[PDB]
Design a protein around this ligand. Structure first.
Ligand SMILES: *[C@@H]1O[C@H](CO)[C@@H](O[C@@H]2O[C@H](CO)[C@@H](O)[C@H](O)[C@H]2NC(C)=O)[C@H](O)[C@H]1NC(C)=O
Ligand SMILES: *[C@@H]1O[C@H](CO)[C@@H](O[C@@H]2O[C@H](CO)[C@@H](O)[C@H](O)[C@H]2NC(C)=O)[C@H](O)[C@H]1NC(C)=O
Ligand SMILES: CC(=O)N[C@@H]1[C@@H](O)[C@H](O)[C@@H](CO)O[C@H]1O
Ligand SMILES: *[C@@H]1O[C@H](CO)[C@@H](O)[C@H](O)[C@H]1NC(C)=O
Ligand SMILES: *[C@@H]1O[C@H](CO)[C@@H](O)[C@H](O)[C@H]1NC(C)=O
Ligand SMILES: *[C@@H]1O[C@H](CO)[C@@H](O)[C@H](O)[C@H]1NC(C)=O
Ligand SMILES: *[C@@H]1O[C@H](CO)[C@@H](O)[C@H](O)[C@H]1NC(C)=O
Ligand SMILES: *[C@@H]1O[C@H](CO)[C@@H](O)[C@H](O)[C@H]1NC(C)=O
Ligand SMILES: *[C@@H]1O[C@H](CO)[C@@H](O)[C@H](O)[C@H]1NC(C)=O
Ligand SMILES: *[C@@H]1O[C@H](CO)[C@@H](O)[C@H](O)[C@H]1NC(C)=O
Ligand SMILES: *[C@@H]1O[C@H](CO)[C@@H](O)[C@H](O)[C@H]1NC(C)=O
Ligand SMILES: *[C@@H]1O[C@H](CO)[C@@H](O)[C@H](O)[C@H]1NC(C)=O
Lengths: 383, 49, 48, 255, 48, 48, 48
């Protein structure tokens, strides 16, 4: 009850005469909405992970995955992946999101060098032929392929780059093979002293050691919750409901609120609109392209008026900033954070400018102010 | 003579409607009660003024 | 002196529209910042 | 087929100020009734833009692309139909070709060897009640190629009683090439139009290449048209979104 | 220094272990922002 | 000194041993043997 | 709690992904040192 909440907030078994702030009330959600796009075809991860032949890391190959359903649990449960490390999501959560594009980058490197695929690293791979951006969002997936991919006298198709005038930019691809003039001399023609053909091959026989063996990398890359989505986890969508407090999820933008049809006019490329506080406050539904206002579920301050425990256990409750046409909706037809209802029974309800006071009778006599409420109103204990 | 009374709900500002944020905010102890108490002190002082 | 809220009855349906987007009082309210009314109304100050 | 038709045809560079342009919607998020701050590659307000005008026989120079470009055309009959981007333009590196041909737009990045004058042409009104673009005289080899896309004609046309203006922004950042656009009719003789508008994002392309220098492509056959080049800079802008959520004014924070 | 400023983006994009490393930064920065505001307000209240 | 001690004993594949860390997921962590996120203890494994 | 107080020393000896975690400590401690100075100065200004 509200008196027990004041005792708990004061950390005392006795409360003196006064008015005390307590936990803000808030209407809790009655059901869950999920709205992903109505897309049905599975994503072609087979073409990415069961490719017959991977690219050399100097010439890493990019595939673009779109308009499809991506069950990442299928990938992540496969013990085939020796490393599966994600940098702006957790692999558990991959099924609960939608992405604006997914680019899979495929290449071969030396197993000890997989360490350099992580974002912001340094060393010859991360410097000269495949660099992730510092803010990279995605998963680096790596596995040993020696038994499929190495050959008995060796495989030698797999060039890396040993030189470059400068570091490359993130997700740059350099196919130039023009001779690297390392010395002070100019160097036309295929070689020279202190002038090198800039690509050189890994040596991979199936006998060579773990860590020196050939590893296949896929890097999955994507961006989240600021743009219109096209790749999705296998989450089933549900009937969109309005004017009720609900747990929504649109394309992975989970939240709690009341949905309503807006007069906002989102440009075709927009999917979310935001308030002053960077919070999303409108959304375009991915299955019927109307723009919905999101409002937080109705809430407010609760303050408890007490004549004090030494006088009485009777208390009165101020729902501050609330018109009490709304507090009768906070009957147990839906749930609230404060579990006590009691005063919500009504009979002695009184709208003040400060919000609605429940459990105190309104009287036309004025008196000296005993417990102050606000906006001219006070309360007191009497016969 | 006075200034606007403000009260700031520390949980709703810091952790707005997340329980698994509220369970971390509890690990900082009394600070939200100090903030509420300080702002309540200021608010009562405005009527006193 | 143009005030910026006085705590009076910002009854949630005002914060349910384009009105809510143009003003910062709804953003403050939704982020747990609440203005509260003075005990004496401007009537009572005028009477004193 | 490609023939080396004479010199660069004198020095055409004119100059003018960019009064109120080259601002664009900075991200895919809706906002309204807000003065919002954004830092990225923008065309500076009142910046000294280069200007080119067709006057017969024409040429388009090789232009730098440092930190990306603003490109615009004042036009009738779509005389400008695309661009080349790269760092060598002679198959020592990859390069990106964009064209709006008579069938459709094509986007392509390959080890291109361009001709010294990449150009296209039309035979005019030749009995079929049509204007056939019978000349694709742009490149001579494309050895290795790593991305290609094709779709349709990009022709947002009534009968040109006011002259067109097409506005583009090009960026090449963290392996993505980013294209923005806007179009309007305009009613000024030669000056760039004073008044506020902002570019929408149109396409994003996973090319992953060094672009140092850029160019623009003339479609050949009496076509009178002109185009403008500005250069973006890393700057901060303040944008006023109205209640409809359109950038209605801006302030360049370093003007 | 968190991956996003919006609390629900962290809680949708990360699991219970890696999320709490990110939520703690938002808690630290926001709690420092309230203690700043309440210090400004207590000092102001002494002038008023 | 420890209040109660329990040794939990089982055999798994060597690549699944990573799943025995607290807060993990995968066939052993999911439907077989789960540690709590506040686990106090040691996980000890050897090739058999 | 950083490995050094010289900002360019940090930016030399560590590579970026953990150098930024060392810089985040100097940012936090120096910003706390300024919030301290400005609080003292505001309380002093009220005495003056
Ligand atoms: C509390 O809310 C109700 C609506 O839920 C308000 O009632 C309306 O008041 C206006 C102004 O007097 C009238 O034009 C409407 O006809 C009323 N509608 C109904 C259904 O009664 C009420 O005024 C609000 N109270 C306060 C103090 O704001
Ligand atoms: C057009 O003219 C240019 C010269 O202005 C020609 O370019 C030369 O081509 C030969 C091979 O035929 C090269 O050995 C020269 O080094 C080139 N010169 C330069 C400066 O690059 C070009 O071949 C001519 N093309 C046609 C089709 O006539
Ligand atoms: C990096 C790359 O793709 N290089 C190839 C080269 O090996 C080949 O000889 C040539 C044939 O035109 O095409 C290109
Ligand atoms: C590769 O092929 C096998 C057999 O068809 C299939 O079961 C497996 O799922 C494929 N790999 C991936 C990563 O899906
Ligand atoms: C791009 O090419 C130019 C000219 O060769 C060169 O100056 C620049 O360093 C190159 N940049 C990258 C990232 O390769
Ligand atoms: C998705 O399915 C619904 C019918 O269930 C349909 O009305 C809607 O048009 C579809 N979405 C799109 C983008 O067409
Ligand atoms: C309340 O306090 C008074 C002393 O101030 C005491 O006489 C009285 O018995 C107390 N009442 C109760 C119910 O404890
Ligand atoms: C107070 O007076 C009004 C008339 O001004 C009357 O309608 C109302 O019923 C009275 N209230 C009580 C509690 O008697
Ligand atoms: C800068 O603008 C003026 C016209 O205002 C123009 O004459 C001049 O050529 C431009 N600057 C350069 C370096 O061309
Ligand atoms: C436009 O370009 C593409 C790619 O070269 C080609 O298939 C198409 O036939 C071209 N159209 C014309 C009119 O040449
Ligand atoms: C008219 O079009 C046909 C193809 O349909 C072509 O063979 C013919 O040469 C064209 N006529 C002229 C004069 O260009
Ligand atoms: C906003 O859009 C409506 C409907 O198109 C229009 O009537 C109104 O004039 C627009 N606002 C402005 C500032 O023009």
């Amino acid at each position: 009850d509200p008196l027990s909440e004041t005792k708990c907030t004061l950390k005392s078994f006795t409360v003196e005469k006064g008015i005390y702030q307590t936990s803000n009330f808030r209407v809790q959600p009655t059901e869950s909405i999920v709205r992903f796009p109505n897309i049905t075809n599975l994503c072609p991860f087979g073409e990415v992970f069961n490719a017959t032949r991977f690219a050399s890391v100097y010439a890493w190959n990019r595939k673009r995955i779109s308009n499809c359903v991506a069950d990442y649990s299928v990938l992540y449960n496969s013990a085939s992946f020796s490393t599966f490390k994600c940098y702006g999501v957790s692999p558990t959560k991959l099924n609960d999101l939608c992405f604006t594009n997914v680019y899979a980058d495929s290449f071969v490197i030396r197993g000890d060098e997989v360490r350099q695929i992580a974002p912001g690293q340094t060393g010859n791979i991360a410097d000269y032929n495949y660099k992730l951006p510092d803010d990279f969002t995605g998963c680096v997936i790596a596995w040993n392929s020696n038994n499929l991919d190495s050959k008995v006298g060796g495989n030698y198709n797999y060039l890396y780059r040993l030189f470059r005038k400068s570091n490359l930019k993130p997700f740059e691809r350099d196919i130039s093979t023009e001779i690297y003039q390392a010395g002070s001399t100019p160097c036309n023609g295929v070689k020279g002293f202190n002038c090198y053909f800039p690509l050189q091959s890994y040596g991979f026989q199936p006998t060579y050691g773990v860590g020196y063996q050939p590893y296949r990398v896929v890097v999955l890359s994507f961006e989240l919750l600021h743009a219109p989505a096209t790749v999705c986890g296998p989450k089933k969508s549900t009937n969109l409901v309005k004017n009720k407090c609900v747990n929504f999820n649109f394309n992975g933008l989970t939240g709690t609120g009341v949905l309503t049809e807006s007069n906002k006019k989102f440009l075709p490329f927009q999917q979310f609109g935001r308030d002053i506080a960077d919070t999303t406050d409108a959304v375009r539904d991915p299955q019927t392209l109307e723009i919905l206002d999101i409002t937080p579920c109705s809430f407010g301050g609760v303050s408890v008026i007490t004549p004090g425990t030494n006088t009485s256990n009777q208390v009165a409750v101020l729902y501050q900033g609330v018109n009490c046409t709304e507090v009768p909706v906070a009957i147990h037809a839906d749930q609230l954070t404060p579990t006590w209802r009691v005063y919500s029974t009504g009979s002695n309800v009184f709208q003040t400018r400060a919000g609605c006071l429940i459990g105190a009778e309104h009287v036309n006599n004025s008196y000296e102010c005993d417990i102050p409420i606000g906006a001219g109103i006070c309360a007191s204990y009497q016969t | 003579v006075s200034m606007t009374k403000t009260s700031v709900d520390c949980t709703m500002y810091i952790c707005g409607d997340s329980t698994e944020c509220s369970n971390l905010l509890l690990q900082y102890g009394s600070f939200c009660t100090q903030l509420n108490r300080a702002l309540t002190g200021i608010a009562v002082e405005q009527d006193k003024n | 002196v143009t005030l910026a809220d006085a705590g009076f009855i910002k009854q949630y349906g005002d914060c349910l529209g384009d009105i809510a987007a143009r003003d910062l009082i709804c953003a403050q309210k939704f982020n747990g910042l609440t203005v509260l009314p003075p005990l004496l109304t401007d009537e009572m100050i005028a009477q004193y | 087929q490609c023939v080396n038709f004479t010199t660069r045809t004198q020095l055409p560079p004119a100059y003018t100020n960019s009064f109120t342009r080259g601002v664009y919607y900075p991200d895919k998020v809706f906002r309204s009734s807000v003065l919002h701050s954004t830092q990225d590659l923008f065309l500076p307000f009142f910046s000294n833009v280069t200007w080119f005008h067709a006057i017969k026989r024409f040429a388009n120079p090789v232009l730098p692309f440092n930190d990306g470009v603003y490109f615009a055309s004042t036009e009738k009959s779509n005389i400008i139909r695309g661009w080349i981007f790269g760092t060598t333009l002679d198959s020592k590196t990859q390069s990106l070709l964009i064209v709006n041909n008579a069938t459709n737009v094509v986007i392509k990045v390959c080890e291109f060897q361009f001709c010294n004058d990449p150009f296209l042409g039309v035979y005019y009104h030749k009995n079929n009640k049509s204007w056939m673009e019978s000349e694709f005289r742009v490149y001579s080899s494309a050895n290795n190629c790593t991305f290609e896309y094709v779709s349709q004609p990009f022709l947002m046309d009534k009968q040109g009683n006011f002259k067109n203006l097409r506005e583009f922004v090009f960026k090449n950042i963290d392996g993505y090439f980013k294209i923005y656009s806007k179009h309007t009719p305009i009613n000024l003789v030669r000056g760039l139009p004073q008044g506020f508008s902002a570019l929408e994002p149109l396409v994003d392309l996973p090319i992953g290449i060094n672009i140092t220098r850029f160019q623009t492509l003339h479609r050949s056959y009496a076509g009178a048209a002109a185009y403008y080049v500005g250069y973006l800079q890393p700057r901060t802008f303040l944008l006023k979104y109205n209640e409809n959520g359109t950038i209605t004014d801006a302030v360049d924070c370093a003007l | 220094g968190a991956i996003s400023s919006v609390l629900n983006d962290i809680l949708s994009r990360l699991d219970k272990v890696e999320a709490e490393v990110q939520i703690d930064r938002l808690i630290t920065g926001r709690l420092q922002s309230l203690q700043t505001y309440v210090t400004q307000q207590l000092i102001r209240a002494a002038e008023i």
